[PDB]
Amino acid sequence: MEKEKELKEYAEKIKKEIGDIESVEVKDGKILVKAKKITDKTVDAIMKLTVKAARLGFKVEVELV
Amino acid sequence: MEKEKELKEYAEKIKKEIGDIESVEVKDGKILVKAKKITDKTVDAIMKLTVKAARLGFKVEVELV
Amino acid sequence: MEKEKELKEYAEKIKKEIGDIESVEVKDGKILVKAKKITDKTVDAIMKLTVKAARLGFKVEVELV
Amino acid sequence: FIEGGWTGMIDGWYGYHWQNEQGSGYAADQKSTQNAINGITNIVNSVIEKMNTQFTAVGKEFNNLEKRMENLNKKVDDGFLDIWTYNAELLVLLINERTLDFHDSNVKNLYEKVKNQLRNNAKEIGNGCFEFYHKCNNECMESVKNGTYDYPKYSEESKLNREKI
Amino acid sequence: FIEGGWTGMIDGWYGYHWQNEQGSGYAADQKSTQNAINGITNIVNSVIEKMNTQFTAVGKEFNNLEKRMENLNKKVDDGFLDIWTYNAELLVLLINERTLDFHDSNVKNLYEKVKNQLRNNAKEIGNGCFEFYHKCNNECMESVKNGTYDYPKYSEESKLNREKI
Amino acid sequence: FIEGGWTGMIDGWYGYHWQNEQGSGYAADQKSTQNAINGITNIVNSVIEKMNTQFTAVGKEFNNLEKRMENLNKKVDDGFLDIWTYNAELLVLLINERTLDFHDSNVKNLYEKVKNQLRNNAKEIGNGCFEFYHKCNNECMESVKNGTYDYPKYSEESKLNREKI
Amino acid sequence: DTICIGYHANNSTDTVDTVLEKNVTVTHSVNLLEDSHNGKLCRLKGIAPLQLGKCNIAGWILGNPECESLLSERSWSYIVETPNSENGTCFPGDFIDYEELREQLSSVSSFERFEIFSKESSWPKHTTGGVTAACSHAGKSSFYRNLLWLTEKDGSYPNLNNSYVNKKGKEVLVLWGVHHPSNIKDQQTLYQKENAYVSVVSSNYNRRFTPEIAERPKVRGQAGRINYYWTLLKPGDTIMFEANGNLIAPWYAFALSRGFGSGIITSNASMHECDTKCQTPQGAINSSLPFQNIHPITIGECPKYVRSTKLRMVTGLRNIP
Amino acid sequence: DTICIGYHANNSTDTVDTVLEKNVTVTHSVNLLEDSHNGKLCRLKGIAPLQLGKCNIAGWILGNPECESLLSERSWSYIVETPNSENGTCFPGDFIDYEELREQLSSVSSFERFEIFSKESSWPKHTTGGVTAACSHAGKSSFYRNLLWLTEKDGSYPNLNNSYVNKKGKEVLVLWGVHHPSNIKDQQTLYQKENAYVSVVSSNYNRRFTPEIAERPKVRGQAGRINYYWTLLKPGDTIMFEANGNLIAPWYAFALSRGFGSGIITSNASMHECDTKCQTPQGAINSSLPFQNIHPITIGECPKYVRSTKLRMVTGLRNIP
Amino acid sequence: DTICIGYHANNSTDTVDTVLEKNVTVTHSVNLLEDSHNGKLCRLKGIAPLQLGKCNIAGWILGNPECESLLSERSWSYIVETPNSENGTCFPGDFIDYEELREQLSSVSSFERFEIFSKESSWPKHTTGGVTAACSHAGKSSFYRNLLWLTEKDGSYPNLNNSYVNKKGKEVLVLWGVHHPSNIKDQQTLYQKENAYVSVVSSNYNRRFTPEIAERPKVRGQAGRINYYWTLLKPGDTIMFEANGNLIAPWYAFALSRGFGSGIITSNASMHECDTKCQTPQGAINSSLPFQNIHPITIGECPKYVRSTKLRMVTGLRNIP
Ligand SMILES: *[C@@H]1O[C@H](CO)[C@@H](O[C@@H]2O[C@H](CO)[C@@H](O[C@@H]3O[C@H](CO)[C@@H](O)[C@H](O)[C@@H]3O)[C@H](O)[C@H]2NC(C)=O)[C@H](O)[C@H]1NC(C)=O
Ligand SMILES: *[C@@H]1O[C@H](CO)[C@@H](O[C@@H]2O[C@H](CO)[C@@H](O[C@@H]3O[C@H](CO)[C@@H](O)[C@H](O)[C@@H]3O)[C@H](O)[C@H]2NC(C)=O)[C@H](O)[C@H]1NC(C)=O
Ligand SMILES: *[C@@H]1O[C@H](CO)[C@@H](O[C@@H]2O[C@H](CO)[C@@H](O[C@@H]3O[C@H](CO)[C@@H](O)[C@H](O)[C@@H]3O)[C@H](O)[C@H]2NC(C)=O)[C@H](O)[C@H]1NC(C)=O
Ligand SMILES: *[C@@H]1O[C@H](CO)[C@@H](O[C@@H]2O[C@H](CO)[C@@H](O)[C@H](O)[C@H]2NC(C)=O)[C@H](O)[C@H]1NC(C)=O
Ligand SMILES: *[C@@H]1O[C@H](CO)[C@@H](O[C@@H]2O[C@H](CO)[C@@H](O)[C@H](O)[C@H]2NC(C)=O)[C@H](O)[C@H]1NC(C)=O
Ligand SMILES: *[C@@H]1O[C@H](CO)[C@@H](O[C@@H]2O[C@H](CO)[C@@H](O)[C@H](O)[C@H]2NC(C)=O)[C@H](O)[C@H]1NC(C)=O
Ligand SMILES: *[C@@H]1O[C@H](CO)[C@@H](O)[C@H](O)[C@H]1NC(C)=O
Ligand SMILES: *[C@@H]1O[C@H](CO)[C@@H](O)[C@H](O)[C@H]1NC(C)=O
Ligand SMILES: *[C@@H]1O[C@H](CO)[C@@H](O)[C@H](O)[C@H]1NC(C)=O
Ligand SMILES: *[C@@H]1O[C@H](CO)[C@@H](O)[C@H](O)[C@H]1NC(C)=O
Ligand SMILES: *[C@@H]1O[C@H](CO)[C@@H](O)[C@H](O)[C@H]1NC(C)=O
Ligand SMILES: *[C@@H]1O[C@H](CO)[C@@H](O)[C@H](O)[C@H]1NC(C)=O
Ligand SMILES: *[C@@H]1O[C@H](CO)[C@@H](O)[C@H](O)[C@H]1NC(C)=O
Ligand SMILES: *[C@@H]1O[C@H](CO)[C@@H](O)[C@H](O)[C@H]1NC(C)=O
Ligand SMILES: *[C@@H]1O[C@H](CO)[C@@H](O)[C@H](O)[C@H]1NC(C)=O
Ligand SMILES: *[C@@H]1O[C@H](CO)[C@@H](O)[C@H](O)[C@H]1NC(C)=O
Ligand SMILES: *[C@@H]1O[C@H](CO)[C@@H](O)[C@H](O)[C@H]1NC(C)=O
Ligand SMILES: *[C@@H]1O[C@H](CO)[C@@H](O)[C@H](O)[C@H]1NC(C)=O
């Protein structure tokens, strides 16, 4: 509950800040990241998101648009 | 002594139950399995035998006839 | 201080005893071994030197002359 | 190059599928299957032997003025439990990676075995199959499967058909 | 065969560099990059999930006649600290080796993908590059990058130029 | 493809055996042997450095009314001993697998080095040997061993003899 | 004509995990984690446990009336308490070093319960009895079976003076108590003197006890207390009891054998005729797997306990039809 | 026309280690070791800690004058002592089972400080006071706030006799002390009798104390000693105090709540308005990394502490321009 | 003309193990497990150990006659007891907190044995002696060297009253005992009063002892007991002794230095002139390997102890001629 809400807020922040990411869908124990490009900025953001999801019980799967 | 006798009884049971195994020779710290085929049934039996031998001090070697 | 001096003495002993080694330079946290050949004797000496350097804080790098 | 296993090969782990004018079917590669089984059993024995039998581990009682000792005992128990859960799960992951790499390497080695046997007498298809330029009867298939393929025996016909193609 | 990465390929981890009469540049191999990212994230989640949260671990006080208990408590603390430092550093080394082997294997698999697509229509250079015998326009490059290279379409021209060379 | 080592190559870990009209013998590949030795020493330093020195660990005495504390102390000792024996043996197994794979990879890389140097000027034998189509004198052997083989220099003779064969 | 190289596949749905990959489907796998059990208490290597059905270690060793049936037991493989083991010390008091006694008893594996001091002849000048409401049994006041409460006889409590020489080849567990009345009138009524002492000594034991008389909150209806003490006699030692009063003398003592693998567990399960080599409070384990997630506390040769929910190792190929 | 296969490279200088290789340069890496902190004390999950600015656990719980401001605190997330927490027991003596009291208090998370025995009405036949130079405050002799020193009134010290019935739903922590004068003249002056006793009992507590009069080395100018004792009342229990003298009676007691995650830490840092989910003596931690090398002792949900100085895992390729 | 690629081989028979493979033959290997030792006791970093040849810690610190030669020792690197260290407390009794004293002494590394109370002048009104059959030496009754047994002089035992001010820069270990006769006649004969007390106090120590007279089983021919006590004086503290009787006064005390790496080991081995950086009860270790399987208990900088019998890591190729 609280973990999912915090991850949703963080995902909204990331989607706003990182223009190379299309969307970040937190749902049902996994975060689905739909990236448009894989650059240094995007990889750093995705690894930060993965570290954030861990210990919150969420796996991260990345799709390249 | 007791471990080897128990393994001998188990090996006799296996050789009777599994028709794809030719023989099971428990001797001198190792169980020599002479299999005729490697099917799902035989692999399951051999892995059960390997788990049984472990902690009884016996290694398992498999020969394909 | 003391570790480096002990390693220097050991390196001098090795350089005297092992004719297949050109020199052994202990300096600044690493021992630089300049071997002329890699034989069983030289490999044994170099591995003994590596084990000796460890826990004395020195890495060993080998150059083949 | 090999995409997916065979549901029809009911015998053996790795093997061959073949077809010619005389017949078709599956057959296990006995040597590689035997080595794979022995390796898997070695992995299992390493996993189980290296774990010692857990003997009687009943808990202790502490009175109301031994809270520090009770907490130290619980700390020891929890620390050992954490360490051993970590060890068990990490060991499982490591041995699973090792085993899957082992199976993939075995399949690759079998493929290379066949390729070395056949040299240029067969067209290599990038899906795990070899097409013989010469006609390969049951004796030829058995020779290839057993690693005793007589390359020069078929060299003339294979070269003739390869040039024709 | 590939010596060093490209500083110009700002997008993707592994990809292609190409040049023809129409243009040149870099492009990422989306499928392999996606799989690599998913694998790396799996490694990160395995590393972090398998570590439990450390909860309150304040120390204990002992009086002048409880030196044995104090030393036992310190022994437990130091033993757990040693074990966990060892576990952390060994885990880092193991996962680093696994990850670097994973990246090398991905690059090798991409190279083999291109080679299987091109067969003998291109000269294989032992530096990670393929030289087409036939002229390869932008459509051909896109087909090769996407794994849909039409081999028979260029077979005649490639054979003609290869024989000429 | 390489079945068994050489008992005659008294110098170096990996190397070459060669024979021509001028002579024959063994020679070590200095670069690969040096890299292998450095890797092995890195493994040894990782194994030994990551283990801390064991300092004074004398046991404790307990009276007849401290049986719980004595059993807790023995429990801590036995748990740490089990964990460290497991760690030592598992580490040995892991590093042995890593080292043997490392040596096999080094031999394979050396073989690929020679193959890339020789291209199609030599017949590749599936036992770890290359047969030159052109005559290869001592200078040619030294060039091949040092990775400076002049491929175009022998292309005409190699092609002539390969076509003749 | 063609020959292909491939590998086995089947209708298995076993799944395993790696560092790179998760939910990998494999043809065959071995589950290294044991999660099933008989759900019963079993004879550990052929010997039944000691079932303290209604009472805990204190009540059994002191022998309160509510588990008198345990006095016929002589040997066991492990000791079983139940979550509702309420009948401990029927008379309120502090069982001194009780946890240490539990630790000692966890390794006994056998005892002989013998009358250390004869009730009829050991105390000819004192009143042998001690029925108290706190230990009421079957509607009547009663008292522990292994302890004897000595009180004044014919208007006096002469100096108590007795000793026992250990003629067993085994350690003898001696238990006694010291009575702490609520008020001075109880002291005078029972022992006829306000200031009495209890002294117990052996080769490696030396204690003196003094009653402490004070009004207390009632526990089980008693404003007094009995502190319970114990000691082990080495096979050749002698134990000497002296008391001016307030002694609740030892009546039965346990000649203790020692063994390996015994322990004490709190269990809700029922006893059954099955045998086992491993036992847990929830039930017996009957597998040779290396790990289990059933219960932290085990007796016998058992798998290592882990928090994991699944430990499957690959013993087959990737299953990819 | 040509197509090449390659991989990414950049201007990164991150370096990682393997078993075979060291100082490997990689395009990107994740540092699994947390080594930065706020350098402040923070509100753990929104609740401020208990800051014992000048006094330690003993001084706070006994309530010596030099940290009187702590008597207004009721709840906290953790307890903070400072390296200069000198003001403990202002009057010298042995705080019995003090470390056990620290262990108990580490998990309280809240208390109600209530007057267990009214000063005016609970001791009508005794002198209520106890100002001593050892606990001097603001230039005047004083005494603990949570303890009441009873002495003779009008030339006598009648038998003290008082009790408290726990009507809270919570455990009540009761603290008292026994005075051990330096010489018999102090005993006669304060309590009017040479041989006095203190007796404290409850359902699960039974102690008797006797003063021990002897010349001692002076500590804080006092040749006497006050031994400090404590006990917890179960939610429904009663505690009874009897004393012929030498009692330093309980005045305030703590009805203790219980919680999870609380602890005691010695810290030099300053308090601030920031929030945190993890706290260390050096400062708060604000990251989700698995490991940290900041401090062994942590409160809250914190990373595992290791001695490592860098734990970087590869999340990229080898960087080889 | 041909060129082949291959690898080294030799006549080695070293064998190693992997997860997949066992008994793999390799050209060269490093044994990470140390299993050889000098089989002697050695000077740890140049300083010889303290060899308690015939007596244990108790006998040495109390200084019983049978290891009087140890009274000339001043410094050591570690303490060695032998499996036959029988001569402890020559007079039977309970050495209180003896294990804690062993723990304290394990870290001393040096002491000065000085006469804390002069025998001739400190007790002018008491009889200085104490020869007892239990501590018989060389055919004559004797007594500890570090303790002084005070008894009545000229028909009385006046109030004992003495103190020592610690003028060392080091902690002073003070040991004393309290005599518990077997019967009242011994009490009257030695101390001339039935009810005597012993009182020992310091800034952080406060105990009172009372003799307990009772018939006991004979140990070493004695029906009495001497309980042995000890305490450490902080560098600036004072210790005061008062006794009405039953005191076995301190005679010599140890000004203790403190160090690192010291410990106590039970060893059967012989002392020799060799030096070492690691010591085990079986013998000294002289290698830099990471692991050893010689003995769990080690002193100095030693390898980690494991149960393994062989730990060989590959440093070469597969040996396949
Ligand atoms: C053996 O254990 C049983 C179960 O614990 C004891 O029976 C229980 O005894 C308590 C205390 O006497 C009873 O509680 C009391 O009930 C009365 C009313 O009857 C009430 O006035 C008191 O305030 C208190 O609540 C409890 O009801 C009773 N339970 C049962 C099922 O009988 C028994 O006394 C123990 N006997 C021995 C010899 O150890
Ligand atoms: C609260 O804690 C403070 C700090 O520990 C106490 O003040 C300190 O008290 C000691 C002992 O009285 C002082 O040391 C003494 O100083 C006198 C000279 O004034 C000297 O003759 C003695 O030998 C001893 O050295 C110390 O100076 C003093 N420090 C300060 C900064 O005041 C205070 O007494 C404690 N009060 C309570 C109620 O706990
Ligand atoms: C120092 O230690 C030695 C060895 O432990 C002591 O000598 C031993 O003393 C015991 C007890 O006195 C002797 O056992 C007794 O022997 C007599 C017959 O002589 C027997 O009647 C008793 O029942 C008991 O068995 C033992 O024989 C004796 N051993 C030797 C080799 O002398 C010695 O008394 C100790 N001295 C001091 C000052 O600590
Ligand atoms: C993949 O693995 C995950 C985790 O091991 C499995 O997670 C379960 O997924 C189902 C379906 O969404 C849920 O109902 C369960 O609650 C999940 N369990 C847990 C523990 O999270 C998932 O089932 C696996 N998928 C496959 C196809 O094997
Ligand atoms: C290679 O790794 C070593 C050890 O991790 C690094 O060691 C440092 O080297 C510099 C330069 O000699 C010294 O000033 C430091 O004191 C060394 N640190 C330690 C902890 O020993 C070294 O810097 C690394 N080199 C590169 C190029 O990354
Ligand atoms: C293979 O490894 C096993 C186990 O490490 C070795 O076992 C020994 O085998 C011999 C011959 O049968 C026995 O005499 C020993 O008692 C066995 N030892 C143990 C500990 O079981 C075996 O020697 C090894 N074989 C080779 C060729 O190295
Ligand atoms: C799997 O296939 C075998 C062989 O046809 C069959 O006997 C078995 O019932 C099948 N199992 C499942 C679960 O479909
Ligand atoms: C009473 O004590 C005397 C010694 O004082 C002893 O001889 C006697 O045996 C004791 N009485 C009993 C019944 O043990
Ligand atoms: C204990 O057993 C009883 C009887 O079967 C049952 O009602 C109860 O739920 C059990 N409790 C537990 C915790 O197993
Ligand atoms: C273990 O379970 C199997 C299968 O139910 C059974 O045949 C065997 O007798 C059991 N062993 C014991 C010791 O109960
Ligand atoms: C690395 O390159 C990027 C892109 O040109 C640049 O923005 C950044 O400042 C560079 N960083 C360093 C440390 O040179
Ligand atoms: C004094 O003790 C009596 C019982 O002896 C009790 O009734 C009374 O309440 C006590 N006095 C006080 C003030 O508690
Ligand atoms: C503690 O804080 C004070 C004040 O900032 C500072 O002077 C002192 O150095 C600090 N000490 C430590 C150990 O942090
Ligand atoms: C953690 O640090 C970041 C960056 O400074 C900040 O934005 C965030 O608010 C911090 N979180 C907390 C709980 O202080
Ligand atoms: C191995 O070979 C070397 C070189 O010939 C020889 O010196 C040595 O004695 C041999 N060792 C054994 C054990 O045969
Ligand atoms: C005896 O005690 C007095 C104080 O009561 C003290 O002054 C005197 O020094 C003591 N005697 C000795 C010998 O210490
Ligand atoms: C101890 O040393 C003695 C003398 O060398 C010897 O007889 C005895 O067997 C040794 N015992 C042990 C356990 O080493
Ligand atoms: C260790 O052993 C070697 C070989 O016997 C010897 O030369 C060396 O002096 C020994 N070292 C010590 C400290 O005894």
Side-chain angles (χ1 to χ4, degrees), chain H residues 218-230:
Chain H
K218 288 191 175 180
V219 180
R220 295 186 58 80
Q222 309 304 310
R225 302 291 186 273
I226 292 168
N227 293 335
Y228 303 97
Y229 305 88
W230 59 275

PDB file of all heavy atoms in Angstrom, chain H residues 218-230:
ATOM      1  N   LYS H 218      35.637   8.298  49.977  1.00  0.00           N
ATOM      2  CA  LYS H 218      34.638   9.291  49.618  1.00  0.00           C
ATOM      3  C   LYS H 218      34.478   9.368  48.107  1.00  0.00           C
ATOM      4  O   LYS H 218      35.462   9.485  47.371  1.00  0.00           O
ATOM      5  CB  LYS H 218      35.022  10.655  50.179  1.00  0.00           C
ATOM      6  CG  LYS H 218      34.854  10.752  51.678  1.00  0.00           C
ATOM      7  CD  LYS H 218      34.990  12.177  52.160  1.00  0.00           C
ATOM      8  CE  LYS H 218      34.703  12.278  53.645  1.00  0.00           C
ATOM      9  NZ  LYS H 218      34.820  13.673  54.142  1.00  0.00           N
ATOM     10  N   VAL H 219      33.231   9.303  47.651  1.00  0.00           N
ATOM     11  CA  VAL H 219      32.870   9.524  46.257  1.00  0.00           C
ATOM     12  C   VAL H 219      31.903  10.695  46.234  1.00  0.00           C
ATOM     13  O   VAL H 219      30.854  10.651  46.887  1.00  0.00           O
ATOM     14  CB  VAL H 219      32.244   8.275  45.619  1.00  0.00           C
ATOM     15  CG1 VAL H 219      31.874   8.543  44.170  1.00  0.00           C
ATOM     16  CG2 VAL H 219      33.196   7.101  45.713  1.00  0.00           C
ATOM     17  N   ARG H 220      32.258  11.742  45.493  1.00  0.00           N
ATOM     18  CA  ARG H 220      31.477  12.976  45.482  1.00  0.00           C
ATOM     19  C   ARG H 220      31.293  13.517  46.896  1.00  0.00           C
ATOM     20  O   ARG H 220      30.295  14.171  47.202  1.00  0.00           O
ATOM     21  CB  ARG H 220      30.122  12.765  44.806  1.00  0.00           C
ATOM     22  CG  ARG H 220      30.222  12.433  43.333  1.00  0.00           C
ATOM     23  CD  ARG H 220      28.858  12.370  42.676  1.00  0.00           C
ATOM     24  NE  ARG H 220      28.122  13.621  42.810  1.00  0.00           N
ATOM     25  CZ  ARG H 220      28.311  14.690  42.048  1.00  0.00           C
ATOM     26  NH1 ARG H 220      29.220  14.705  41.087  1.00  0.00           N
ATOM     27  NH2 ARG H 220      27.571  15.775  42.259  1.00  0.00           N
ATOM     28  N   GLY H 221      32.264  13.255  47.768  1.00  0.00           N
ATOM     29  CA  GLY H 221      32.239  13.767  49.120  1.00  0.00           C
ATOM     30  C   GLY H 221      31.454  12.943  50.115  1.00  0.00           C
ATOM     31  O   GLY H 221      31.365  13.341  51.283  1.00  0.00           O
ATOM     32  N   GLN H 222      30.880  11.816  49.701  1.00  0.00           N
ATOM     33  CA  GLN H 222      30.040  10.995  50.561  1.00  0.00           C
ATOM     34  C   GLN H 222      30.765   9.706  50.919  1.00  0.00           C
ATOM     35  O   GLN H 222      31.300   9.024  50.040  1.00  0.00           O
ATOM     36  CB  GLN H 222      28.714  10.669  49.872  1.00  0.00           C
ATOM     37  CG  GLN H 222      28.002  11.879  49.315  1.00  0.00           C
ATOM     38  CD  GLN H 222      27.751  12.937  50.365  1.00  0.00           C
ATOM     39  OE1 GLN H 222      27.241  12.648  51.445  1.00  0.00           O
ATOM     40  NE2 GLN H 222      28.118  14.173  50.055  1.00  0.00           N
ATOM     41  N   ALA H 223      30.773   9.375  52.207  1.00  0.00           N
ATOM     42  CA  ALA H 223      31.274   8.095  52.680  1.00  0.00           C
ATOM     43  C   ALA H 223      30.174   7.051  52.788  1.00  0.00           C
ATOM     44  O   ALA H 223      30.454   5.914  53.177  1.00  0.00           O
ATOM     45  CB  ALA H 223      31.956   8.262  54.040  1.00  0.00           C
ATOM     46  N   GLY H 224      28.930   7.415  52.473  1.00  0.00           N
ATOM     47  CA  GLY H 224      27.831   6.480  52.443  1.00  0.00           C
ATOM     48  C   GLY H 224      27.510   6.048  51.022  1.00  0.00           C
ATOM     49  O   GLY H 224      28.112   6.495  50.050  1.00  0.00           O
ATOM     50  N   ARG H 225      26.540   5.146  50.917  1.00  0.00           N
ATOM     51  CA  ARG H 225      26.119   4.622  49.629  1.00  0.00           C
ATOM     52  C   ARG H 225      24.612   4.418  49.629  1.00  0.00           C
ATOM     53  O   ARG H 225      24.014   4.114  50.663  1.00  0.00           O
ATOM     54  CB  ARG H 225      26.815   3.297  49.306  1.00  0.00           C
ATOM     55  CG  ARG H 225      28.331   3.369  49.279  1.00  0.00           C
ATOM     56  CD  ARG H 225      28.829   4.177  48.101  1.00  0.00           C
ATOM     57  NE  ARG H 225      30.281   4.129  47.984  1.00  0.00           N
ATOM     58  CZ  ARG H 225      31.115   4.957  48.599  1.00  0.00           C
ATOM     59  NH1 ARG H 225      30.676   5.918  49.395  1.00  0.00           N
ATOM     60  NH2 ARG H 225      32.422   4.815  48.412  1.00  0.00           N
ATOM     61  N   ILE H 226      24.005   4.596  48.461  1.00  0.00           N
ATOM     62  CA  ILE H 226      22.605   4.263  48.236  1.00  0.00           C
ATOM     63  C   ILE H 226      22.565   3.257  47.098  1.00  0.00           C
ATOM     64  O   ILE H 226      22.879   3.598  45.953  1.00  0.00           O
ATOM     65  CB  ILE H 226      21.756   5.495  47.901  1.00  0.00           C
ATOM     66  CG1 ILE H 226      21.646   6.416  49.116  1.00  0.00           C
ATOM     67  CG2 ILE H 226      20.374   5.063  47.423  1.00  0.00           C
ATOM     68  CD1 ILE H 226      21.073   7.785  48.805  1.00  0.00           C
ATOM     69  N   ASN H 227      22.167   2.025  47.400  1.00  0.00           N
ATOM     70  CA  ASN H 227      21.975   1.030  46.359  1.00  0.00           C
ATOM     71  C   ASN H 227      20.586   1.186  45.762  1.00  0.00           C
ATOM     72  O   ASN H 227      19.595   1.285  46.487  1.00  0.00           O
ATOM     73  CB  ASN H 227      22.155  -0.379  46.917  1.00  0.00           C
ATOM     74  CG  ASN H 227      23.576  -0.654  47.351  1.00  0.00           C
ATOM     75  OD1 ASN H 227      24.515  -0.030  46.863  1.00  0.00           O
ATOM     76  ND2 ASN H 227      23.743  -1.597  48.266  1.00  0.00           N
ATOM     77  N   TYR H 228      20.517   1.205  44.436  1.00  0.00           N
ATOM     78  CA  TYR H 228      19.283   1.493  43.720  1.00  0.00           C
ATOM     79  C   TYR H 228      18.730   0.209  43.122  1.00  0.00           C
ATOM     80  O   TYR H 228      19.453  -0.525  42.440  1.00  0.00           O
ATOM     81  CB  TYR H 228      19.516   2.530  42.620  1.00  0.00           C
ATOM     82  CG  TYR H 228      20.105   3.821  43.130  1.00  0.00           C
ATOM     83  CD1 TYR H 228      21.467   4.061  43.056  1.00  0.00           C
ATOM     84  CD2 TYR H 228      19.301   4.799  43.691  1.00  0.00           C
ATOM     85  CE1 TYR H 228      22.008   5.234  43.522  1.00  0.00           C
ATOM     86  CE2 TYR H 228      19.834   5.973  44.161  1.00  0.00           C
ATOM     87  CZ  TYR H 228      21.188   6.186  44.075  1.00  0.00           C
ATOM     88  OH  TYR H 228      21.724   7.362  44.542  1.00  0.00           O
ATOM     89  N   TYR H 229      17.451  -0.048  43.373  1.00  0.00           N
ATOM     90  CA  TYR H 229      16.786  -1.265  42.940  1.00  0.00           C
ATOM     91  C   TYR H 229      15.561  -0.901  42.117  1.00  0.00           C
ATOM     92  O   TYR H 229      15.117   0.249  42.107  1.00  0.00           O
ATOM     93  CB  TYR H 229      16.375  -2.122  44.134  1.00  0.00           C
ATOM     94  CG  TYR H 229      17.514  -2.447  45.065  1.00  0.00           C
ATOM     95  CD1 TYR H 229      17.840  -1.603  46.113  1.00  0.00           C
ATOM     96  CD2 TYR H 229      18.261  -3.598  44.899  1.00  0.00           C
ATOM     97  CE1 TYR H 229      18.876  -1.897  46.964  1.00  0.00           C
ATOM     98  CE2 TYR H 229      19.297  -3.900  45.746  1.00  0.00           C
ATOM     99  CZ  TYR H 229      19.603  -3.047  46.777  1.00  0.00           C
ATOM    100  OH  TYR H 229      20.643  -3.344  47.626  1.00  0.00           O
ATOM    101  N   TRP H 230      15.022  -1.892  41.414  1.00  0.00           N
ATOM    102  CA  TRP H 230      13.862  -1.660  40.567  1.00  0.00           C
ATOM    103  C   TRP H 230      13.157  -2.981  40.303  1.00  0.00           C
ATOM    104  O   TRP H 230      13.735  -4.058  40.462  1.00  0.00           O
ATOM    105  CB  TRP H 230      14.268  -1.001  39.250  1.00  0.00           C
ATOM    106  CG  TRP H 230      15.237  -1.824  38.485  1.00  0.00           C
ATOM    107  CD1 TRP H 230      16.589  -1.841  38.631  1.00  0.00           C
ATOM    108  CD2 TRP H 230      14.933  -2.766  37.455  1.00  0.00           C
ATOM    109  NE1 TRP H 230      17.148  -2.732  37.753  1.00  0.00           N
ATOM    110  CE2 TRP H 230      16.151  -3.314  37.018  1.00  0.00           C
ATOM    111  CE3 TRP H 230      13.748  -3.197  36.856  1.00  0.00           C
ATOM    112  CZ2 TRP H 230      16.219  -4.269  36.012  1.00  0.00           C
ATOM    113  CZ3 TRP H 230      13.819  -4.144  35.859  1.00  0.00           C
ATOM    114  CH2 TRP H 230      15.044  -4.671  35.447  1.00  0.00           C
TER     115      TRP H 230
END
